[PDB]
A and B are shown apart, each in its own frame.
With several copies, the nearest count.
Chain A
Amino acid sequence: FGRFTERAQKVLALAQEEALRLGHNNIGTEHILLGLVREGEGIAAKALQALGLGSEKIQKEVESLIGRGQEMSQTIHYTPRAKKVIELSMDEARKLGHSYVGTEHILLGLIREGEGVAARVLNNLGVSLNKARQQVLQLLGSNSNANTPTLDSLARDLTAIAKEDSLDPVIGRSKEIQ
């Protein structure tokens, strides 16, 4: 529905790889989830390895709730849920200054829209929903006297703010300055 990392894009198409590997006809949130733990290298992939959720443990729950397998594969499309889940990762990244979506955000985006099959795989694999958004978080991060009070915003600090190398040109009004 836009542009993400390779890692995102691969993980997404990778849901489809899994769409069919089981023969189902719509790729729901459950396949997006298989997609993430199966590209095994995304931050999303990495996290799942934390909660104790390899591809092994997961796919067993999933096949234990759907199984084969109408090879139909009549050029498939998404679940409306998962289409929401994608619309969401886009927002779970606006919410992070991340100019582009990727493996994490999609995992972020799933938790947010918890109603669905992925979510149940885990509330079934004894992994409440918040213990999970946590694990992804603890793998990303960031980038003073009286400033305490001042330093609301109100009213941003021209000085140290442009001390961080972070400043441009700037063209004057060069004798306007002095």
Chain B
Amino acid sequence: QKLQFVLRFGDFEDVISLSKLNVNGSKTTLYSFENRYYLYVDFCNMTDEEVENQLSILLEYATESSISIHRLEEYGKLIISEHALETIKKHFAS
């Protein structure tokens, strides 16, 4: 089972919102593309049950884009690497 996902937020504030929680063993990176912001999540070692779980939460705040992840790595616009969530929490939650 796959352990890396790419999600699209409709408006940026949706992302801040997601930040205000717990990333947890989750490397994550955030792109800007077609005006909408995509976010790329990477779970290192977790049980499938453990990941189908966690991903649930994420999609209260996003949807899962069919987008080839490498399209981003090439033609995207990087905004935050590896610790993408973590950073927005700093400059935005209060």
> Taking the nearest CB of chain A, how far is it from the CB of B55, in angstroms?
8
Closest residue to B49 on the A side, CB-wise? A124
Secondary structure type dominating chain A contacts: loop
A67-93 contacts to B, CB under 8 A, are 67, 70, 72, 74, 77, 79-82
B82 close to chain A: CB less than 8 A: no
Query: How big is the B interface, by class?
Result: 20 to 34
B40-65 contacts to A, CB under 8 A, are 49, 52-57, 59-65
- The listed residue (B18, B21, B53, B66) touching A70 by CB distance below 8 A is B21
Q: What chain A residues lie within 8 Å of B17 (beta carbons)?
A: 25-26, 77, 79
Contact yes or no, B53 A64, CB < 8 A: yes
Interface size on A, residues (CB 8 A): 37
- The listed residue (B20, B60, B65) touching A30 by CB distance below 8 A is B60
A28 close to chain B: CB less than 8 A: yes
Among A26, A70, A138, A139, the one with the most B-chain Cβ atoms within 10 Å of its Cβ is A26
Closest residue to B54 on the A side, CB-wise? A65
Closest residue to A79 on the B side, CB-wise? B60
- Apart from A30-B56, A81-B62, A124-B53: 8 A-B pairs, beta carbons within 8 A: A7-B74, A28-B60, A42-B74, A43-B74, A72-B20, A79-B61, A115-B63, A124-B49
Q: Interface on A for B, CB 8 Å cutoff?
A: 7, 24-26, 28-30, 42-43, 46, 64-67, 70, 72, 74, 77, 79-82, 102, 115-117, 119-121, 124, 138-143, 165
Q: Interface on B for A, CB 8 Å cutoff?
A: 9-11, 14, 17-18, 20-22, 34-35, 49, 52-57, 59-68, 70-71, 74, 93-94
